[PDB]
Symmetry: D2
Subunit: 417 residues, 4 copies
């Protein structure tokens, strides 16, 4: 019987097990033998067939019959990447041929897919067919607008539930939480959590007009919302910040971010965006009775058990991968568009400028973004022109209306309105 | 004086009602509108007594609605009272709305609620009152573009999956079969959604039966074949999800057997009382006679009212916020007698008459599309005897032996089921 | 070779079984023991065929059990197969245990499972095998010191509260009364726990009835009084929780009315089949006849099997870890024919004789203590007519008016209920 | 009718609303008037009765009938503390008499109870009765042993569920998470979450023998656990750290903790331990020492998301009984008492019985590291015990995993048996 091998690459997302079971269960009904490589390409890169065998397992019906309820991945994952070296690529080719892998399914991000195509192109098309399923919790695949990637629904819903507790806590014991939503790629995850939870403010890189963000502008955007809420008798709230703000900041802004120190280098992971904003905002607003606390919402989302939408989603993706193999497809991506799972050749999705799959960002011109902005607390262009409103907000900050306009009014040219 | 927006809910609750109320109210308050809410739908507006209506209306303020987007249910309650049947009731609703000076009237409910809103509007001047309705259903049976859900459906399906997950673990830990009955007779979207997500071994919905009337025996035998095939693979346990809508597709003879070889119950006006039917219990009793000797135990379980007021999941929280905003946008843009729906990621008003089915006069009902790729994929992961499975004699021998019957006896009893349901 | 520890589960699952299996297995593996698990309790050990047993036993390794403490159910399954009835079966179990060289034998189950283990142990030499059983019950009906829970109860009560919370929101959103039936006939701990936690308006458990046999009419009237009092305060909705144990206290006459004025269903041996009873449904049908004219609708809801394999809450995860450790400690200290229980914060073995009730030959059943302060506190927050309430003429007038009857009729019908249930 | 005034103090815990609803509903059945002070003692300390009146609300049936489902507190809370000044204490007394509060219920932890008594001793017990309910997710009130404070079960259960997700993620994508469990008073919460979730290590201040912890010892306790797992083929795990380790650290340890800088301080000269990042600092050090071995280490805080979770059934029943017991203590003439539950009975316990004689403040209940429960929890942790350090084969295996000689490993790590109880 033909052999199907499955591996995972990248960081986990809810529903990985859904894809593994959807592909494996269907393939077993076709009589295929299914194996799974542990930790992605990590051991295939060695080329030692004894080492690979010690870290491959037989994906049987009993193993995969009930993993669709479970977060994470039963065959683990790694970022091991054979595309960098031709020797590593040939080590992967050597082990796959030894195991007679006829069909090769990789579940991972663009890096995982790129490794799969690199191994396949140097291989004969008759012996092995390679398909990859694109995975990302950031919802940044170029699907038709409003169509989500698998894992995104689970991450956003658990994120909403965490922020709900912080909304109740900020009101019960007045304070502001600056929630930092992990992920520097796009603003989908931060905006989704914020809109669902009714957070009072959300800042994503996509809403900044200029190409580089300044640290001062971020502080003042949060500061204006805090003062406006304070002008309405509320000294508390929650503000959600996409970590992607950091990767759009200028060199000078990063210098201030790291404590007016030189930024570390080989390193945006060491940045503490929410904490730095908390310290500065306490200097400016602590005298008003405002306390500010940072909180990151990251790794606890990646292996949450999938919500029903992702369980259905990944089952259909697993079926679609096996279907593509049966129809002779190779070097393709299993994606779902308009309710249909279809193979899509890798380059058809690539951005020529990047060499990687195109990144779908938040469309800040869409009606959905404007609707989300409507329910946020913020100072618009019209608000700065409202003399009564500006007087109350400035008074809340214990400064003159002229001083408030002088400091904050320019922000209407910093972010889309 | 500021314009008055009045809000009411009709029908059975679905998760996210408060989200629509909070979206419409918060935006309206930013526009300076005064917002009021009618308790229990059309119940008191139908009386025509303005004192009774005022005793059951409340002021929807910022403080009230600021955090109800987290909460299931509806803070202004709901009712199925329907003024559309009588012109006296319709004029009573108009009399009370004019008394309260309602400029904008938003109803959140099913088709009966939307129709009542439109009937009240036709007798009213378009300048004095504008009427918008937001379509709500956990059954997902609105005619939106295919694969796009109605609000509350995602919450109901996700909680349904979690309950069935416990029953899946319990069925395997202590071998048994659960017949889960998914509440809702309109369509099979909810039953199939829960079953596919939870990996249930079988799902039966009215949409997959080719004939116009289902027979009670055919339902029993479809489950029986699934139980036996699982038993042929060493598994004497499972979970089967049944859309309650099977009952409403059943023939007269089938309903007689369903109610215990009794005369089906009827209401005072002659409508058969299908709420008193217990599909999962009746099928379990029949299957226990046939399969108990094999070591099979079967238990019914209903998944109903615990879904309706579950707190909305993030998808519905965003959905109902966008719908509430869209209701206010439609009022500002002069629309009336329209339904706020979301299509391809855009919330827009759609005129009520544009959504009617001309043959019926009512809003068209979207059922499960059993020819779609989604339904075929769901069917693949179910345990069942396909057309090809009945022709595989090695398989038929193993299943027949599991049921303690001859291969010829098995073919005679069950093979006709391939003409009962689409394959 | 290393000592062999064999583990099986019997009876119905409870949350935390896997915690006990992992607690015993992890500690034993650190001691160098070999650990095996029998699938489906005594089911295959009863055959006596050692090849059949080996095909349904698995090696409990570190990798198998390292993370099952998060998971409900039991990875080695369970059954109610019971070898105590026959020594032909008991000796079949003895034959397989000796073949597998089981030095230590741990069973997690009810009284049948514990008794089967000791019966098999009595025929074996004390040097070759030591037998320990961990008592399991989600009903909280073990004779622990009062207010101390059995493992699995905290999880079941908490999930039950969450279900009733959705029904409390739904009953208020769309006015109705839910009659929630908490499955389990041994005691009222589970029904009373869910009701108190969720703030349900009424709870009825068999333990609060003074007489030895309950009448169907009295149960109907106790609910009826609560509905009327709530109706007298403007609330035409609520939730009432009923322990299924009420059925097992009902008189012969009461059971006749319960089953539709029919002869109660019976098994082949002539014993009544109370599982076929539908307590919540029958009470709902009767209460609708009496109260439908008042605008009351009533719906039943069962809370049963979805509790048994829910993932354990933190209290049960810690509990079952300590029980698993205590079983291995008991083996190390030479105990046998003992029950591993936790009392006053200490896991200890307790000899079977200390817990058996001589009148029954089964472990003593701890029921709700209706004289305790905890029960009185729970009753305070219920809606109900007390002795003092019936003597309040102003209150009786309002409740009777809510029921559309004279105060004399109300007192004549309902006042006797103060002698039916403890006050 | 008599007036019952209710306030919440301290950080929120799940079930505050349960106490408010239990006390308010029963008091309303007795015909009492119930009011609630917003934000604890914050406004009562001003002495301005006009301001206090603007921040009190009438606790009615409709307000409280269904808040037993809800986390947080509808009357908010604060750490405002009249205990510090006699000037403030008289301000609270002045406002309470002005509002004619006969019964005064405070819902909070040890600091809140102590503040209530300071107000109580200068007031007549007949004129005003002051009762407090035990609130803390830190479980550090001096209740009868094995009896939890309310909110602890909810916090521990949500903590278990969060750590479960981190457990699946650490195994799926091998890494170590250093979870920092908020709370410096005691180790009940950190140890509870770790035990329920099967975390590989838990460090609480209670298990350190010496009075002052050294930063190097904390780093090495985690390092030994990581290396031992590495010796068994596991390069991933979860370690739970009580934030209270920070408050036991010596002056030198705090200097290293804040980046080899002088610790930040408030205007009075006390160290600002809130600015410390225990898990982050340990992660940086351990990545330097172990990154080459294939170890990735990430810090993670489990704090504020626990405090206002909706209560679990145990806390719902608990706080319902506590609110009832508070009203019962009022009816029976008790004052200056704490409502506690022991053997299924809610009873008042006079405040003085709970004071620590050396301190004058409410005694703080810590983890009893000699108890059987702690020993059982420790057995399921990954760690090097005294007997493990004396096992020559084990030491060779772990040392090889850490790429060091057995002699080097013994020199560095064996002294830890005198650092922490065994
Ligand atoms: N930026 C904002 N976002 C959301 N709501 C707001 C904002 N500013 C004001 N509101 C609310 O919208 C309404 C505006 O009314 P007013 O400020 O009284 O003209 C009030 O209910 C405010 O609390
Ligand atoms: N109707 C079905 N649905 C899902 N899986 C099945 C079904 N029938 C058989 N299987 C599984 O598919 C695989 C192929 O079975 P076989 O017919 O033995 O080749 C085995 O793992 C079976 O348990
Ligand atoms: N049986 C009951 N259980 C709980 N609360 C009640 C009950 N009866 C009345 N109440 C409430 O107790 C308060 C005082 O009642 P009353 O003495 O009638 O004014 C009101 O909030 C009533 O709604
Ligand atoms: N410190 C520890 N805590 C918990 N389990 C352990 C520890 N050390 C080893 N184990 C496990 O306990 C068993 C004892 O292994 P050994 O004593 O080396 O044969 C193996 O399953 C190990 O994985
Ligand atoms: O009940 P088990 O044999 O463990 O398997 C349960 C199976 O149920 C369904 O019918 C699906 O085909 C599978 O996705 C699932 O694995
Ligand atoms: O991380 P794994 O090796 O899969 O196992 C995780 C282990 O962690 C803890 O430290 C306990 O010793 C075990 O109860 C648990 O199984
Ligand atoms: Cl200073
Ligand atoms: Mg404290």
């Amino acid at each position: 019987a033909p052999v199907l091998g499955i591996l995972c690459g990248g960081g986990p997302a809810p529903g990985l097990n859904g894809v593994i079971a959807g592909a494996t269960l269907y393939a077993l009904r076709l009589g295929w033998k299914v194996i799974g490589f542990m930790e992605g390409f990590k051991y295939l890169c060695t080329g030692d067939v004894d080492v690979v065998k010690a870290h491959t397992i037989d994906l049987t019906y009993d193993i995969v019959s009930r993993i669709h309820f479970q977060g994470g991945t039963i065959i683990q994952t790694s970022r091991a990447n054979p595309r960098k070296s031709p020797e590593l690529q040939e080590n992967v080719r050597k082990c796959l041929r030894a195991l007679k892998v006829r069909y090769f399914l990789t579940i991972g991000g663009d890096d995982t897919a790129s490794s799969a195509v690199s191994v396949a192109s140097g291989m004969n098309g008759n012996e092995i067919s390679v398909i990859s399923c694109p995975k990302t919790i950031d919802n940044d695949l170029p699907l038709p607008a409003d169509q989500s990637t698998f894992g995104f629904h689970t991450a956003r819903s658990l994120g909403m539930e965490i922020i709900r507790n912080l909304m109740v806590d900020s009101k019960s014991a007045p304070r502001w939480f600056l929630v930092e939503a992990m992920g520097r790629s796009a603003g989908h995850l931060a905006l989704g959590m914020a809109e669902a939870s009714g957070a009072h403010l959300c800042l994503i890189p996509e809403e900044f007009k200029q190409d580089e963000i300044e640290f001062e502008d971020v502080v003042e955007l949060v500061e204006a919302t805090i003062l406006k809420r304070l002008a309405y008798g509320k000294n508390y709230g929650v503000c959600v910040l996409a970590e992607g703000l950091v990767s759009k900041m200028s060199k000078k802004a990063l210098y201030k971010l790291f404590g007016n120190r030189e930024p570390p280098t080989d390193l945006l992971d060491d940045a503490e965006l929410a904490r730095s904003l908390s310290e500065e905002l306490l200097k400016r607003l602590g005298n008003l009775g405002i306390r500010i606390t940072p909180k990151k919402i990251g790794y606890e989302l990646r292996c949450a058990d999938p919500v029903a939408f992702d369980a259905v989603y990944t089952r259909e993706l697993g079926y679609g991968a096996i279907d593509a193999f049966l129809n002779g497809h190779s070097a393709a991506l299993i994606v779902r568009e308009n309710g249909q799972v279809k193979p899509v050749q890798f380059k058809d999705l690539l951005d020529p400028a990047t060499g990687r799959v195109r990144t779908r960002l938040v469309d800040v011109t869409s009606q959905s973004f404007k609707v989300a902005r409507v329910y946020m607390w913020r100072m618009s262009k019209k608000d700065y022109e409202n003399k009564d409103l500006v007087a109350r907000v400035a008074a809340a900050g214990k400064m003159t209306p002229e001083a408030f306009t002088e400091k904050f009014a320019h922000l209407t040219d910093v972010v889309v309105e």
